[PDB]
Design a protein around this ligand. Structure first.
Ligand SMILES: O=C([C@H]1Cc2cc(Cl)cc(-c3ccnc4cc(CN5C(=O)CCC5=O)sc34)c2O1)N1CCNCC1
Length: 341
């Protein structure tokens, strides 16, 4: 309900699984929302424009009192069924949406916005111990998938992510003209993006069974997340102190089940729980501490963090002015014609 919280829900579409969680997470990334409204979609066809459908949802989430539909957006990118959602993960859907949006933004006033918000850079290195050979690759990333099994927390997951693997014994390094070799393998963060998307690896392959078994472990994650010690070169002018923004959560059976996002939309520690059409207020503890794990003696799977330095910019106030007039004309013209029944 909008009166209690200020925010509105999305319609209970069970087929969607994790979409409603992601849409809210992306909508309350305000800098994206403003940029999305600027996309020049006056050209595009209503039924099939992914940019337009994400403008429609955003528009409505901002303006509506009653819960917001997603039927037109699901039809655009072509994941109408439950199996289309099951087959993919949340980060892949986030790529399907943002890769459309970034591509529409090229050659516009709002180009670069998706990399501005979401794209960090990292080095993957292989280094031989005895011989002088080193292979570096630079990779961009839009999201980090962290290991949780045996890890108490995010600090420990990052320790693991960056930690150095030894290529010795049977699994030595094939080092070209220099032959098979004892070597160190590792990864190093260069930049951490303003909006940081972390997936927690809740599934592993199992040797017996021949299937993916889920992990219902206590995995602790903090409101304030310092990450300078996981960068190669730090900056005193801009530390990598991250502030928690959203927590995406699953419960119940995997073949379906119930999805919720917990959110901190102003970044002021005032938490709400977005259960599909029912937005409500909740404690910090309901959002953070209570979504840690199977502690009776429900699991968090994605976490969003925002860079403290970039917080005011990222979560800048959206106004009705920030949506173009022609887009307001178009989207109200649908609501005029569709109501006329
Ligand atoms: O089993 C499920 C249900 C139930 C279910 C339970 C939980 Cl606690 C999380 C998800 C979930 C939902 C969305 N995204 C992601 C990403 C995750 C990170 N991760 C892995 O763990 C392995 C590889 C990877 O990237 S976990 C996840 C989920 O979905 N699905 C079948 C497979 N794809 C999703 C649907």
């Amino acid at each position: 309900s909008k009166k209690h919280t200020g925010y509105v829900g999305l319609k209970n579409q069970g087929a969607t699984c994790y979409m409603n969680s992601l849409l809210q997470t992306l909508f309350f990334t305000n800098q994206l929302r403003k940029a999305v409204y600027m996309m020049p979609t006056e050209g595009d066809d209503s039924s099939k424009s992914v940019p337009l459908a994400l403008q429609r949802v955003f528009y409505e989430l901002q303006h509506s009192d009653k819960p917001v539909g997603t039927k037109k957006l699901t039809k655009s990118f072509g994941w109408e069924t439950l199996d289309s959602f099951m087959q993919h993960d949340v980060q892949e859907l986030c790529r399907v949406l943002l890769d459309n949006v970034e591509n529409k933004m090229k050659g516009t006033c709002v180009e670069g916005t998706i990399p501005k918000l979401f794209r960090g850079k990292m080095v993957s290195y292989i280094q031989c111990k005895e011989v002088d050979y080193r292979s570096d690759r630079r990779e961009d990333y839009y999201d980090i998938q962290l290991s949780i099994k045996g890890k108490k927390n995010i600090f420990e997951s990052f320790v693991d992510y960056v930690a150095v693997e030894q290529l010795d014994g049977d699994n030595k390094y094939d080092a070209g003209e220099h032959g098979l070799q004892e070597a160190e393998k590792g990864v190093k963060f260069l930049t951490l993006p303003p909006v940081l998307h972390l997936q927690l690896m809740r599934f592993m392959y199992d040797p017996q069974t021949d299937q993916n078994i889920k992990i219902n472990d206590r995995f602790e994650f903090p409101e304030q997340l310092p990450l300078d010690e996981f960068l190669q070169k730090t900056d005193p002018k801009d530390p990598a102190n991250y502030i928690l923004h959203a927590v995406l959560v699953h419960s119940g059976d995997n073949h379906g089940g119930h999805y919720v996002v917990y959110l901190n939309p102003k970044g002021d520690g005032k938490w709400c729980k977005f259960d599909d059409d029912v937005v409500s207020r909740c404690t910090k503890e309901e959002a953070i501490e209570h979504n840690y794990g199977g502690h009776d003696d429900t699991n968090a799977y994605m976490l969003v963090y925002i860079r403290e330095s970039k917080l005011s910019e990222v979560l800048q106030a959206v106004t009705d002015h920030d949506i173009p007039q022609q887009l307001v004309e178009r989207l109200q013209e649908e609501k005029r014609i569709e109501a006329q029944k």
